[PDB]
Design a binder for these strands. Structure first.
Ligand SMILES: Nc1ncnc2c1ncn2[C@H]1C[C@H](O)[C@@H](COP(=O)(O)OP(=O)(O)OP(=O)(O)O)O1
Ligand SMILES: [Mn+2]
Ligand SMILES: [Mn+2]
Length: 430
DNA sequence: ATTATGACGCT
DNA sequence: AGCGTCAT
């Protein structure tokens, strides 16, 4: 009853760019705008691999991970933009720099947690409190929420999507008690007003559109974000959770998309997030461990406490390349040349990072994969990163891996390497 | 031959 | 530390 926490203490948003790498390429090249188009890396093997798809192209069935030649079978007029290649490898710098553009705009409104190259969480609790005093018990006009969906509405007592959106929004606003400065629903609404403003700023100042979710925690905010994409934002209230979760596959919730989620389904014989409410906390802890069990018990009730961490910059800087099938590295000279290529891109990014962000990495992590293994990584070894010098870093990387070579022969490498990875970690201020 | 990343958990 | 999981 009165002592039962409801996880309504915070206002959290998740802002996620719409078909991000595609929009970066469409800003650069106007011919690609408002077209079925995708971003591809490499070209020689089956037209290259698709890593981003415009909403026009999705309508034809084009998806991420599809080969471009296969995508063209679904969409013959599909337009393609290629990822830049430097030192023999895909180079994602243009998209990292576009990410920074967006992150710096978001940071003007609130402290953000960078969650990926194209999304960040926002803790809006304080900003909401401030806007609420500005408002002075003034009602929130629908005009302040021109792209917002209220999940679960309209309900009860109609043909257009925008018409439905506004119907739901009006039901929501009509019910709001604006007199209470601590009503969670009011706080979420004001949160949504601020995110409309954030999203307008991102679009005005970069040309990029995005979607967003507004709720009381990160997991619900992310789920909300995807409910109405592209170019829209969705408010998921605490009250909307039982209906929303009653038909929500468990795999849809962040962190449950893999083996744990499959185990929840198999062991408990359920399909939907809401079905978890029928287990005790101890029951869930018995199956899934103390931490997961407690997390699941609260999460299926819409409650989660993971903070929006104040971190805008990535914690690691890495450079990775696969060498699939017959391209696998089988000579020492091969392995050394590619370590140098990776090390050279790493040095470039590290040096820029040091100038921009007043920090220095102190540890170099080296990872490889060997033909036959189908783990992502076969071996991970660390060494000291004492200077930003590609020749030194690549020599050091070779040193820490060179005894993986089963070859009795100096010059040959066996088994061949199907992946190399250099990652700079453990930053210190400088 | 679903690539290039990047965060966090376990022991 | 080195490995595994989950993510975009
Ligand atoms: N598995 C991947 N491999 C390589 N790059 C990826 C992968 N997933 C995502 N990316 C890149 C390209 C994406 O444009 C960008 C953002 O990813 P994501 O938010 O999942 O989709 P998206 O922004 O392209 O479309 P949308 O978010 O509108 O569905 O990150
Ligand atoms: Mn996105
Ligand atoms: Mn994303």
């Amino acid at each position: 009853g009165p002592h039962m926490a409801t996880g309504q203490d915070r206002v959290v948003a998740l802002v996620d760019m719409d078909c991000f790498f595609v929009q970066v390429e469409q800003r650069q090249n106007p011919h690609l705008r408002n077209k079925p188009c995708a971003v591809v890396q490499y070209k020689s093997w089956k037209g290259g691999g698709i890593i981003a798809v415009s909403y026009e192209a999705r309508a034809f069935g084009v998806t991420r991970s599809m080969w471009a030649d296969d995508a063209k079978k679904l969409c013959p007029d599909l337009l393609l933009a290629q990822v830049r290649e430097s030192r023999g490898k895909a180079n994602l710098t243009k998209y990292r720099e576009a990410s920074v553009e967006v992150m710096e705009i978001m940071s003007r409104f609130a402290v953000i947690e960078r969650a990926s190259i194209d999304e960040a969480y926002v803790d809006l609790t304080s900003a909401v409190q401030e806007r609420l005093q500005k408002l002075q018990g003034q009602p929130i006009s629908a005009d302040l929420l021109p792209s917002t969906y209220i999940e679960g509405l309209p309900q009860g007592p109609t043909v257009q999507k925008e018409g439905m959106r506004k119907q739901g929004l009006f039901q929501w606003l009509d019910s709001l008690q604006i007199d209470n400065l601590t009503s969670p629903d009011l706080q979420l609404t004001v949160g949504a007003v601020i995110v409309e403003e954030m999203r307008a700023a991102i679009e005005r100042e970069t040309g990029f559109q995005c979607s967003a979710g507004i709720s009381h925690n990160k997991v619900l905010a992310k789920l909300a974000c995807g409910l109405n994409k592209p170019n829209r934002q969705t408010l998921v209230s605490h009250g909307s959770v039982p209906q929303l979760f009653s038909q929500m596959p468990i795999r849809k919730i962040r962190s449950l998309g893999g083996k744990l989620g499959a185990s929840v389904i198999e062991i408990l014989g359920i399909e939907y997030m809401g079905e978890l409410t029928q287990f005790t906390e101890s029951q869930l802890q018995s199956h899934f461990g103390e931490k997961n069990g407690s997390w699941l018990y609260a999460m299926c009730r819409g409650i989660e406490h993971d903070p929006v961490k104040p971190r805008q910059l990535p914690k690691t800087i890495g450079c990775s390349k696969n060498f699939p099938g017959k391209t696998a590295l089988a000579t020492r000279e091969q392995v050394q040349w590619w370590l140098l290529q990776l090390a050279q891109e790493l040095e470039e990014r590290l040096t820029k990072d040091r100038n921009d962000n007043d920090r220095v990495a102190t540890q170099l992590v080296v990872s490889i994969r060997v033909q036959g293994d189908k783990r992502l990584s076969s071996l991970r070894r660390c060494c000291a990163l004492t200077r930003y010098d590609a020749h030194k870093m690549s020599h050091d990387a070779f040193t820490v891996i060179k005894n993986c070579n089963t070859s009795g022969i100096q010059t040959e490498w066996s088994p061949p390497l199907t992946m190399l990875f250099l990652c700079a970690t453990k930053f210190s201020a400088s």
